[PDB]
Design a protein around this nucleic acid. Structure first.
Lengths: 550, 61, 38, 141
RNA sequence: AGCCAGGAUGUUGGCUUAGAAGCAGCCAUCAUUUAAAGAAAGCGUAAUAGCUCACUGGUCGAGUCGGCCUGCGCGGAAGA
């Protein structure tokens, strides 16, 4: 009924976009503002609507004109239904009309196979096409029986169908917990086998727990119908149970302690930096997820393994956003929300060679250690390599371990900002010692000095993290998709087509890669998706060198 | 403050633990132990003897 | 448009007119190429 | 010889016969199949050979599959397995890089019974001599 | 100058090419058939691109193009 409301236009898309085999099941009388009645081809009957309050309806025959338009669509329908019932096929060509009962059987036996999609219509606000869509329900919508059995696994290990027989083992899945003020914890469940019973005992294999279901309950659109049992294929809520969180498999209290499938894998796409202000809030936050992570396992919490700050795994802007209201409100926590940091690395360009001296001779524990090394940069992604390059043994055998633990060590705080100075090869080619003064330790320092300076001297370079990304996009949007990525300090790598879509691979800096979801979904109106992996570290464009001196 | 007993623990900033009474006469001002295998605390990888302390499940034999 | 002491044909589709008494650039293909006060 | 309506060219060889990595999804995403491609494809590809880069027609209207009458390979596809380098350029004019000849790719240019301008097979002879010199080679012609 | 036309062949061009098939990038700037068509002019696709160009035919039918020397003018030009 709303302007631009063109039925066809949809179908001109439902096969143009996704591309299925929909079937015109109705033709509206009065396109848009002139929304009166409607017509069902299959049953060639016409109904009408005199109002929008949903009262003055009626099945009034076709209004003069129109009529003709029908037929053909009621023929194609039957012609369509033909690809299912040979009976509704011959009778077609012979000149007989399929029975209103065998005709339905075709459509129905056809949808259920995911081959066709019966299209109907009507202003839901004006109460139109609803009572007819409802018939559309039963008439073509599958029954808990017409559907393919759930697989589960025995305690031993082997797949197996779960039969919808309300007399086999009891097998039910859970899917939604809710706190009721009147009856408390509610656990809506979909039964598959056996039959749950009011005032019994169940068993959740998932968390090996004996739950005691006390009361069964069915939600009626306006009251609490308290029933006595849910037989396989039926849905409702149980009252009792405490350890039963989402996706839980409940069997009889003796049945094969089996576990259904359920395995869904919707990981994240967008994260944020959450620093809980003074250590005070850092707690309110712990509890925050300690209950929020059960009330929605559609996220992930992680403490950045390199810098305190914790990440908040989401599945789209809004997602994390509205958590930020509850986690900050219904938890009164008030922290910070900026963006993650980047795991940088230090290293050098030119190879150097400096002295590592220590000696402290005043009178006793002399402390005498000294060494010379050969520092040389290695390919971005080389690692750590030292060199026991001591001839006869100017540097005793027993002290090398320690002169390494010293070099290895020092490499912790970079010469520039203080990050893991990596990607280099070290060569100990000299250094002397003292008979009495030297110490395992005295050397660990001297060597931790030779290094603490070769990097300062060999011109340091602030390396950074590069990612591997693959945006799946219809080459429709592609054009800009690649652009945007270029203007992101990134350099493209290719696009080997996929399905109707096309994939793009390339590298990027984690800094200039934040909140990419809501940027990709921008250049693609939604038809865009990406992945991401690590690869290597690489120099910052110098302009970003003095930038980081923070 | 609290000891984290055992060899190797996966604990960090923000980790909620449970802790019991038990000083560590060696470190000063450590009058408590972290209860391995409690809330966020982990049982110790690979342990075999004395598992119940150190929070480690009887390995599926 | 840009208004400025040195107006020039930018692309090959700029034309330079004068109207009233004022040198302007028109350009069929480039709104940005519009110019005044030449 | 008519007008627009159905043709792509984006392969890796007659070797790989319908892959999804360096191509794949849009190997057929409008009226062509990610699957059809050892059918009308290998209607002769493995009868004769799988080991030279070659695309082919699509000829699309509204008749289930396609009528892409298939055919020839490029002319630096035979600068790897018939003349020279398996990649090529390097530093292309920083010197002579590589080097071919006249014999080198006569009967190698000479086969195509489907493509080339002119019965003069001295003219469409040196017609391919610079697909090898789009890389910067030497002329032992 | 309009207008009616053509705008190609190796070559989807080899290529540190994830995908390039002229395009920030690759190098050179050579090379086939024609009336003539640039391994390159463009706003610019997920790529095949669709659509105009530099360059060529027809039409029309006598003028047309823009450097130099000089005169007078024009914009550049807002204050209590």
């Amino acid at each position: 009924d709303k302007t631009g409301a063109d039925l066809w236009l949809v179908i001109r898309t439902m096969q143009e976009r996704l591309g299925a085999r929909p079937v015109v099941m109705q033709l509206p009388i009065g396109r848009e503002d002139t929304f009166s009645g409607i017509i069902d081809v299959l049953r060639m009957k016409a109904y009408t609507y005199g109002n929008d309050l949903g009262t003055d309806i009626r099945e009034i025959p076709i209004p003069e004109e129109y009529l003709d338009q029908a037929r053909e669509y009621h023929e194609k329908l039957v012609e369509v239904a033909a690809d299912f019932d040979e009976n509704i096929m011959l009778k077609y060509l012979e000149g007989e009309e399929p029975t209103e009962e065998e005709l339905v059987a075709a459509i129905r036996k056809g949808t259920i196979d995911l081959k066709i999609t019966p299209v109907f219509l009507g202003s839901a606000l004006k109460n139109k096409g609803v009572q007819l869509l409802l018939d559309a329900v039963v008439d073509y919508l599958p029954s808990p029986l017409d559907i393919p059995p759930i697989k589960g696994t025995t305690p031993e290990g082997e797949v197996v169908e779960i039969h919808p027989d309300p007399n086999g083992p009891l097998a039910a899945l859970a899917f939604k917990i809710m706190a009721d003020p009147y009856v408390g914890r509610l656990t809506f469940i979909r039964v598959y086998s056996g039959t749950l019973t009011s005032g019994s005992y169940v068993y959740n294999t998932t968390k090996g727990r004996k739950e005691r279901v006390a009361r069964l309950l069915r939600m009626h659109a306006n009251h609490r119908e308290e029933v006595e049992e849910l037989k396989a294929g039926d849905l409702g809520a149980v009252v009792g149970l405490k350890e039963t969180i989402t996706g839980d498999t409940l069997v009889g209290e003796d049945a094969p302690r089996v576990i259904l499938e359920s395995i869904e894998v919707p990981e994240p796409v967008i994260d944020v930096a959450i620093e809980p202000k003074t250590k005070a809030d850092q707690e309110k936050l712990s509890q925050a997820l300690a209950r929020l992570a059960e009330e929605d396992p559609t996220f992930r919490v992680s403490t950045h393994p390199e810098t305190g700050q914790t990440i908040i795994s989401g599945m789209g802007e809004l997602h994390l956003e509205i958590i930020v209201d509850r986690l900050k409100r219904e938890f009164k926590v008030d922290a910070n929300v900026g963006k993650p940091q980047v795991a940088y690395r230090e290293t050098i360009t030119k190879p150097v060679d400096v002295e590592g001296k220590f000696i402290r001779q005043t009178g006793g524990r002399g402390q005498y250690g000294h060494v010379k090394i050969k520092v040389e940069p290695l390919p971005r992604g080389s690692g750590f390599e030292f060199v026991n390059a001591i001839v006869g043994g100017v540097i005793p055998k027993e002290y090398i371990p320690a002169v390494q633990k010293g070099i290895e060590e020092a490499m912790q705080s970079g010469p520039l900002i203080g990050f893991p100075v990596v990607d280099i090869k070290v060569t100990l080619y000299d250094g002397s010692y003292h008979e009495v003064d030297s110490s395992e330790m005295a050397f660990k320092i001297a060597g931790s000095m030779a290094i603490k300076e070769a990097v300062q001297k060999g011109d340091p370079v602030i390396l950074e993290p590069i990612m591997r990304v693959e945006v799946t996009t219809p080459e429709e949007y592609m054009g800009d998709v690649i652009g945007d990525l270029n203007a992101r300090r990134g350099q493209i790598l290719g696009m080997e087509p996929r399905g109707n879509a096309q994939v793009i691979r390339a590298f990027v800096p984690l800094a200039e890669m934040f909140g990419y979801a809501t940027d990709l979904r921008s250049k693609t109106q939604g038809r865009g998706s990406f992945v991401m992996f690590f690869d290597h570290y690489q120099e910052v464009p110098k302009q970003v060198q003095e930038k980081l001196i923070k | 403050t609290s000891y984290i007993g055992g060899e190797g623990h996966n604990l960090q900033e923000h980790s909620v633990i449970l802790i019991r009474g038990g000083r560590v006469k060696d470190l000063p001002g450590v009058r408590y132990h972290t209860v391995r295998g409690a809330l966020d605390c982990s049982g110790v990888k690979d342990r075999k003897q004395a598992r119940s302390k150190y929070g480690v499940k009887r390995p599926k034999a | 448009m840009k208004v400025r002491a040195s107006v020039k044909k930018l692309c090959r589709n700029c034309k330079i007119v004068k109207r009233d008494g004022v040198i302007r650039v028109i350009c069929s293909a480039e709104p940005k190429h519009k110019q005044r006060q030449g | 010889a008519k007008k627009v309506q159905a043709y792509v060219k984006l392969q890796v060889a007659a070797g790989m016969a319908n892959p999804s990595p360096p191509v794949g999804p849009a190997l057929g995403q409008q009226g062509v199949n990610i699957m059809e491609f050892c059918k009308a494809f290998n209607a002769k590809t493995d009868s004769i050979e799988k080991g030279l880069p070659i695309p082919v027609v699509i000829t699309v209207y509204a008749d289930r599959s396609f009528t892409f009458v298939t055919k020839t390979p490029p002319a630096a596809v035979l600068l790897k397995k018939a003349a020279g380098i398996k990649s090529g350029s390097g530093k292309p004019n920083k010197d002579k890089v590589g080097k071919i000849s006249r014999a080198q790719l006569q009967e190698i240019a000479q086969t195509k019974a489907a493509d080339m301008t002119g019965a003069d097979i001295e003219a469409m002879t040196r017609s391919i001599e610079g697909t090898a010199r789009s890389m910067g080679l030497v002329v032992e012609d």
